[PDB]
Amino acid sequence: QAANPYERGPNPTESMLEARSGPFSVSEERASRFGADGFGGGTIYYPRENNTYGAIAISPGYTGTQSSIAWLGERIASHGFVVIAIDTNTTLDQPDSRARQLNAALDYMLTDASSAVRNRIDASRLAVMGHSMGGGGTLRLASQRPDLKAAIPLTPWHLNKSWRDITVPTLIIGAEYDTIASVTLHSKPFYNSIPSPTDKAYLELDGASHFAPNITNKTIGMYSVAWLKRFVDEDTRYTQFLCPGPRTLSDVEEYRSTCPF
């Protein structure tokens, strides 16, 4: 019973979570395509301050590259995380392949990145995220790695609709008007399959296209950071944003959750 050892940064506000950057200055290190084993390389964003933080790997979708998701890796790192935005071995790789590559990327941050990166990661506190087939890869990795602290699939796409074995806190973010990975066929079946007692939430962005996660988006930014803070840092200062959660007439079409977790 003491102050949370993983707490980082100032007491949070909605304004602070909606801003383009959080309170940590960030630096970047390349994971070379000519040096990354089992994935396509990427960029690691990390806080300049020398402390330890949770580590997160983020996968783009089909035809996508690290630039599709770079804004989000940078924004999340600026809240006190080490985050790799990956390129895949090929841009046509399937969701299960993206799952192995998110796994490789975690391993890369822990073993093969520079000293500066490795010294800033608490190796025991990891999470994964991903857009469309990358969000399918997130669900698969989450299923296979119950040691992970959180999973955030973003407009996910996967042909397997049943994720009943996931025990990792999962936030699925769907897009109301997604014409590629319709929430009817992908996000809602995925979320509906995860049973109690797993913590989870479903947040559907009102008005959003499939590509919302590829452009700076204050709703994805705020709620992705709140989720990673609550589950990767166990930072209960962030529960207030998640529970009862967004007003649902607004930028959120629907929000379901297992609050207060």
Side-chain angles (χ1 to χ4, degrees), residues 148-170:
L148 300 172
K149 301 293 190 189
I152 304 172
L154 302 169
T155 63
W157 188 106
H158 208 291
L159 297 183
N160 175 48
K161 307 305 181 179
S162 159
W163 294 103
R164 72 185 180 187
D165 292 307
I166 296 181
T167 186
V168 174
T170 297

Side-chain angles (χ1 to χ4, degrees), residues 108-177:
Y108 178 93
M109 286 189 290
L110 293 183
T111 313
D112 293 338
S114 74
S115 283
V117 172
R118 298 181 287 108
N119 287 351
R120 276 169 177 71
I121 290 185
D122 179 348
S124 75
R125 298 190 291 120
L126 309 178
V128 293
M129 307 177 56
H131 181 215
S132 203
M133 282 185 192
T138 292
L139 285 169
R140 171 73 73 191
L141 193 60
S143 193
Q144 302 164 327
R145 293 199 56 175
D147 59 288
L148 300 172
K149 301 293 190 189
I152 304 172
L154 302 169
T155 63
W157 188 106
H158 208 291
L159 297 183
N160 175 48
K161 307 305 181 179
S162 159
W163 294 103
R164 72 185 180 187
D165 292 307
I166 296 181
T167 186
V168 174
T170 297
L171 163 62
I172 285 164
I173 298 194
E176 192 185 359
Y177 293 133

